[PDB]
Amino acid sequence: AGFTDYKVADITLAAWGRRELIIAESEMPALMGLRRKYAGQQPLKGAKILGCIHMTIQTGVLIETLVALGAEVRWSSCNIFSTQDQAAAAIAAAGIPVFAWKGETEEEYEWCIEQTILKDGQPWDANMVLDDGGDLTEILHKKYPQMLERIHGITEETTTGVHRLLDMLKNGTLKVPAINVNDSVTKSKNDNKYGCRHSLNDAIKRGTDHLLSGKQALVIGYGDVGKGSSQSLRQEGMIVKVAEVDPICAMQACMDGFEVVSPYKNGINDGTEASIDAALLGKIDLIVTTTGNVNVCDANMLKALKKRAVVCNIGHFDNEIDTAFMRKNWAWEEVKPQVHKIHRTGKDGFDAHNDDYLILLAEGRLVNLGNATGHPSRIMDGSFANQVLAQIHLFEQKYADLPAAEKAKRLSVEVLPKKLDEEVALEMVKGFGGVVTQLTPKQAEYIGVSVEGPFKPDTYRY
Amino acid sequence: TPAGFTDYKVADITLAAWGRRELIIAESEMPALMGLRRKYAGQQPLKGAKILGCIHMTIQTGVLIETLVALGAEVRWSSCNIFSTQDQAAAAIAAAGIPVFAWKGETEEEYEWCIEQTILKDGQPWDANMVLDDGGDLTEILHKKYPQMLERIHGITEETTTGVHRLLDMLKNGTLKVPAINVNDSVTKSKNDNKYGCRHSLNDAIKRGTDHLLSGKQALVIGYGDVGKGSSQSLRQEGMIVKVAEVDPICAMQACMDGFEVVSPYKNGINDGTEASIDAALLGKIDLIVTTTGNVNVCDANMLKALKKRAVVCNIGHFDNEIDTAFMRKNWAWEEVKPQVHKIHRTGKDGFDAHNDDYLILLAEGRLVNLGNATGHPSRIMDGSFANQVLAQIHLFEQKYADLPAAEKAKRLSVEVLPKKLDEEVALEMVKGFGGVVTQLTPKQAEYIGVSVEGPFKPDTYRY
Amino acid sequence: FTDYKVADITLAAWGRRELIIAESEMPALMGLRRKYAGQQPLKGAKILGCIHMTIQTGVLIETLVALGAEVRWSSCNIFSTQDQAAAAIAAAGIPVFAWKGETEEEYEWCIEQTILKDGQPWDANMVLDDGGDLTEILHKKYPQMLERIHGITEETTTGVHRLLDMLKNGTLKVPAINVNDSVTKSKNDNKYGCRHSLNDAIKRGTDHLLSGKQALVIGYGDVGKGSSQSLRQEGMIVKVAEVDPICAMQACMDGFEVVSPYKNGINDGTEASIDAALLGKIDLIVTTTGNVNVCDANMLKALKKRAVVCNIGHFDNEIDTAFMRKNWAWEEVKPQVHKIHRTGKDGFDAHNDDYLILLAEGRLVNLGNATGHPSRIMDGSFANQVLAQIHLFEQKYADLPAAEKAKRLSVEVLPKKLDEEVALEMVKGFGGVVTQLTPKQAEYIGVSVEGPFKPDTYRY
Amino acid sequence: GFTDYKVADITLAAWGRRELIIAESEMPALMGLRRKYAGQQPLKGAKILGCIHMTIQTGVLIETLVALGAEVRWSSCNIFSTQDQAAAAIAAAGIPVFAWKGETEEEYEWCIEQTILKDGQPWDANMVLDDGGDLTEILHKKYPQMLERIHGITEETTTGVHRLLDMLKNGTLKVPAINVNDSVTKSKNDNKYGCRHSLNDAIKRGTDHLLSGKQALVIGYGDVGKGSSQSLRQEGMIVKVAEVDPICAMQACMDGFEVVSPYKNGINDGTEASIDAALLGKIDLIVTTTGNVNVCDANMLKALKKRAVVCNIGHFDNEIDTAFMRKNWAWEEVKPQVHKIHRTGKDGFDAHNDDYLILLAEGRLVNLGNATGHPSRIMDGSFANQVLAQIHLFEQKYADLPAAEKAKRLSVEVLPKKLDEEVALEMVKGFGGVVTQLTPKQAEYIGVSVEGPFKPDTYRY
């Protein structure tokens, strides 16, 4: 009643978003269990959280969990295509500041982040940061150092964001401590792998409705995202080849039943067209990038790809594919939103019945979020239960209030303790109806653990 | 070959030529191990090394032994399981003039005697200076019974999850006398051997022991660590309906996402000791139970009493006490079908009816079923583990821990893993053995993700 | 041109873009265009068509038109139309009456609009049907029109069953080709198509994670086999129900547990017959039978809270949706997704936890909540449709003497050689390379180098 | 003093009996027939010549036929497929059996002759059970007078059925036959799932090779090729499939396999130049599944990747050109039914030569040659069909019919669908599955009887 501190595509989508939020709550037992567990204690009372992460239905349940535990938030998406407008509307209609819509320009994207940082044209009294990819974190360090003075910590969602934090720590420019939410096992080995298993072929089907069975796929990378992506395609019947620079991950791809290939002859990428294995790329129907790296689907690869192959990226940033080359040289025909035909016959105009094109999804942005709805609620449950625990821990540490000498001892990038990782996992398992066995005292003694855990040494890889 | 060679004990020396044929095949399946032979033979990095080895005397172990020998070492060898030896492997090694004391179907007395034959030479302790172990039994005998021999030993290289746990317990208690390398926790060991090895060899052993159809039947896998993961896949890929038990909620979460139903043998997961806590309806529909935990009594007497008639029971963890076979020896009549396959008749202890329908089938008497009823992991998988073993031996032997003063010794008494760079190089040779082609980072790409073009490519915290 | 009714004609450009893509995914169908365009085998044909107005059906329509036919088209399901496909077809001057989200009355009206042109019966002479509704209407309401029609080509299992019942009863008036039982239709479309589109529609409707959850698939025919695989490949724990013990045997061997909703499989009408413990653990039930009431009122009452219920058989009476309309309160989440509150009939609590999620109001879920089978699968089905239309039209049954008609009134299938020729074009679409027998090899197994390679009894 | 047999070692009988008793518990359809028909004795007076792999599973089939009243004289239909403990148990039961693992071609022939002749004269046979048609062929060629008194043939396998159909075409088939192969509880159980179980089984037993990550080429994608492809893919092999039948190739593509031909553009013209050398040089394992001749030929064998495994799971060994390899290359036995073929020449070999192939079972049926064939619970379906087929033809008494009535009954038929369904039901109950019963309204709605059959005869499953 009188609330205008937001900007979304269409506020009238709020009732629809609320119905989906109520469904999503029943799919997120770990997150909803934290709501019940900590509601009375109000551990986030006084927290003022700047949030930058895909404004999906799942992020909506996270936001309302943080608010239910006492926090105030100002929110934006971390990607121009990842917002679900009904989710953003439901949040704005709850009186929560959110600046996000599907299909933002790059200028609107930066504007939205700035609207969370500033309130009434001045720095909001923020004291916590929740980030996904590091864009909000970077803007605060470069443009608002005075705000970081009063911020107790950053909780970072994803592999790329964590790498940017560690680079800051290395160079001595990180100003506040952070929790690496990515490397909880109930995040990295749930979200990053199983989420892409669910949502990759989902996005491809919604964007193209292509049959995948019997066709040839090339997955660039075999980390957590590349493992889930390769399984997403293989389980549909694709013939999947895997490329990697890490021989250990390549070993896993071989033992997992994939043929390991390189886009470059003998894997040497010397920048020439002669280095391209034209015969291999000429047979690929679908290429997916999963690396977090730069230019792993390059211009010479794009020139050599089979006619009408689908090109997409599920890493965090669109620079995995040389889309800039494609904008400079090839004509773009929009099929529908986030689906473009790229005509390799020239830059000026195209023949509507030309057969020499590629199909680009989400203009190279995160394809699961751009062309579908990203990961499902029951997977994001794990990641976002970790987020809430990480927020609680850093806000209770109160780094911004410590003496300079104590700040120096706590300026670090840490992960959550394994006991909490296990506690999130148990709620997830109970959500499936799974029944964990309890050790007897003798069994716990035999393997050297407490009956209640943790059950593995910190070196354990699962 | 040495004239008059008698310093061995095997089942049947006439199997030697057959064993040699299989070793030559296995060499073509083990490019990382054979690459270490070619690369290091001239330098002789193990010259002067005198290695006590205790690990399953398979064809794959034969290639490992002859690699150590080719790099300059002398060895004296036993198996770390009474059923895991391949008799043609042991014969080929003995025929090559290498002291080996190992055969399939040892008694427990014979098993202990075999280890002692490696420790002793001509009635007196051998002047060993290196130890290679799998499960910790030889490590334990040396510490317990021959502690003075440990004064000359530079290191232990331990193969498997259970052995590493025993070493860590010793280290924390101040009873470990020499440094050790945890070979198990190389990624090219743990996440290759322990998982993929069991995927290959669990259904292999069950087929060879029973020739049972697995498709369409119900399986319960106890444990979902690396071995439990590999075991569950071995059975699911055959078409079994697989249920998974775990005490670790993170591993249970993985089982759920992997498409398994997670269940407990005990109502609400609580074993209160009584029969009333057994989920009898669940156990009464299980056709196959596999233990994978490295823990004790995870398939207990009450579970065995409740299992569906004619269910198969087996253990693929390191030690047989995962199943309470002692209870079954005490109370039920055992009918040998063929070696390492027993029908266990739940009608009573004394006799059994030849046509009784109420029995279970126990494989390998509860010992590691993949090595007991088949041949364990395949050569191309053991290549990774045993390349790590060779590199661990070279590193510790060149360190010369036993030659340091007591002060410097306290500084290096540790249990270490091999560095990731070496893990990656082992993996690269494995990938090349499949004909896989690894891509090389450009300089700009390596700078972008903060790695060297030559690796390592991941931080030490990375879990793969 | 105004002889059409669609949801939004301005979607036509979008529809045309997706048709141009679809043509690249349908090599058997496009090969028929190139090879028969010269002959124009369908010149003078006037086809009444009733099949899901999808992008895939658009390529079928334009193939028939390319070969000389005129058509008047409707969808065979109220939720299966893709509005951009209907628009593109209407914009090309082809009469079509079809939109997504028709009422039952509008569905009947749409078919009537193909049958009638300017208030009078169109001079149709061919029928292309999917499920038999159009066939039924012509026989019951417009029987004199059937005197000019040379044949019916029927797409799907349910519709073929209806054709055979009329044949047995002596009420079928024109010959028909059973398109369903070409191998490149039944064992491509019915199975592999549902494998692609079932989990697709469930994700689009609910965005639920499927890995780790319990599914019950009722039926294990071709649709049940594909549906079960759609779910198992996602990591669902899939149980299968069947009344056919051979199909049940296949489910066991395929690695599924075979269960019945009823104790000992005996459905005696009582709630006591329901296996409440089994149904209380099921997160998703999918009906695939073509039978009636295989997910009945007592099962719906026993289902786990918040289970998803859906049907991928042809008709929406596989689930007792009428029971739910009469007794429980429906809350629309979004189009074709309803929460069904088991707390009562009049009103519901927005936060009630005791509900079921019904997809597409019990109608064909793959077409209702997604886009049905992909173009490359529908290629096989629709190539058979074209060949069957050519064959029946050139036989000219309506022009035969009465004695010649009696010998010609049957339900037949396409010869295996044509089935194999369709398959070869599909294989080449994947880049597959079929080996050619040597003369000695052909003689050794008793086939021609040209094929057919299997006897008509072979089951593949 | 029973001596009317020949087996490898009669002292293996007790071990064989232990395994028969287990197999009985794995074969509920077959044991169900045993219990249902024992008192009626429907095979009393039946005297069966049987020629089929002398496995434990065949042992249960034999003793079921005997339990229902039949007398039999048995041989194996393959030189490597007998399980010697199974043969010993049968012999020790007083049942004439002539079979051991590792026969020569001469011994194979002699064993079939020992079933046909008793005490030097033709046995008073009146039924035939065959697998592959060798016994059927010997009777037609050499013992026509015996066929005058024989009521029928029940033939197990695709290749044997093809040979029956050629005889029927040519007017040379002398007695009616039941095609047991084309029951759904046989062809789409045994041929497919049986090879799924036992192909990777035999390869592991023969070589202990890791299969995950390696490249396989399966020739054919019928029932056996489908099961064989799954056997390898589920182990993590990268599987390519070859086919001449584009419908079967279509299935392979849709099932997620790349379909390739050993020959460029699929044209097998007999030249080395027509071989896809790049493809063949990548293959670690080739498996033939066709029932055809020379589908893994000499030019394919010359082009294969060094140390590739070569094997055949079709009925006969001429699917691979082993004759070429015997004539040109040096054979090194690794162990029984495993040979390295050194492509360096014929006159000897280097023990450390790297250029060899591994051939399993000398090109004979690999699942039976290098392991134990299909598991009991799968053979349960095939062999329940065999028992029912024997009962049906023996009760028809074709040999006693007048000449005009023989003409009307001389045919190759399959068992009716109702029997096929009842077999399947016992298999399903053996898994603990629960089949649902149609209501009367539901049976009326789909036009079937509540008890079945549930499908028209044209249904393909």
Ligand SMILES: NC(=O)c1ccc[n+]([C@@H]2O[C@H](COP(=O)([O-])OP(=O)(O)OC[C@H]3O[C@@H](n4cnc5c(N)ncnc54)[C@H](O)[C@@H]3O)[C@@H](O)[C@H]2O)c1
């Ligand atoms: N879309 C999603 O839902 C989602 C979810 C989680 C993470 N992500 C993003 O996906 C990316 C990957 O995440 P991750 O957790 O899998 O990281 P990771 O470190 O586990 O894996 C990335 C892999 O890429 C490989 N790689 C790097 N450069 C390569 C090259 N040139 N060619 C081939 N392979 C190469 C690396 O060897 C590594 O194994 C990150 O940007 C992350 O933020 C996206």
Ligand SMILES: NC(=O)c1ccc[n+]([C@@H]2O[C@H](COP(=O)([O-])OP(=O)(O)OC[C@H]3O[C@@H](n4cnc5c(N)ncnc54)[C@H](O)[C@@H]3O)[C@@H](O)[C@H]2O)c1
């Ligand atoms: N047979 C082989 O070839 C082979 C190979 C490698 C290791 N192993 C042996 O297998 C065993 C397991 O090794 P690993 O690497 O998988 O270890 P691991 O630690 O990775 O996994 C063991 C798992 O068992 C679970 N567990 C423990 N007690 C349990 C109980 N009561 N109920 C259910 N689950 C329980 C633990 O939570 C753990 O996840 C060890 O003894 C190891 O030496 C055998």
Ligand SMILES: NC(=O)c1ccc[n+]([C@@H]2O[C@H](COP(=O)([O-])OP(=O)(O)OC[C@H]3O[C@@H](n4cnc5c(N)ncnc54)[C@H](O)[C@@H]3O)[C@@H](O)[C@H]2O)c1
């Ligand atoms: N949605 C689609 O895209 C699509 C595609 C093809 C066919 N269909 C439709 O799907 C239905 C099934 O087609 P099909 O080709 O699989 O037919 P089918 O005859 O091969 O399979 C139906 C199966 O249901 C089983 N069944 C019957 N009553 C049952 C009951 N009470 N409980 C359990 N199982 C029962 C039958 O035994 C049979 O195996 C038909 O209505 C057909 O028109 C839909």
Ligand SMILES: NC(=O)c1ccc[n+]([C@@H]2O[C@H](COP(=O)([O-])OP(=O)(O)OC[C@H]3O[C@@H](n4cnc5c(N)ncnc54)[C@H](O)[C@@H]3O)[C@@H](O)[C@H]2O)c1
């Ligand atoms: N080993 C076993 O346990 C076992 C079991 C059943 C059958 N068999 C035997 O296996 C063989 C195949 O039986 P089936 O039931 O699969 O028969 P099938 O007719 O179903 O399939 C054989 C396939 O081979 C294909 N083919 C023929 N020539 C080819 C060539 N040159 N290249 C590629 N593909 C070619 C055919 O198109 C056909 O699809 C027969 O000899 C049969 O008796 C063996």
Ligand SMILES: N#CCNC(=O)OCc1ccccc1
């Ligand atoms: N009593 C008794 C045994 N009867 C039974 O189990 O059924 C026998 C049977 C098997 C296979 C097909 C048809 C009948």
Ligand SMILES: Nc1ncnc2[nH]cnc12
């Ligand atoms: N185990 C077996 N016994 C008899 N015939 C078979 N054919 C295939 N496997 C068989």
Ligand SMILES: [K+]
């Ligand atoms: K989602």
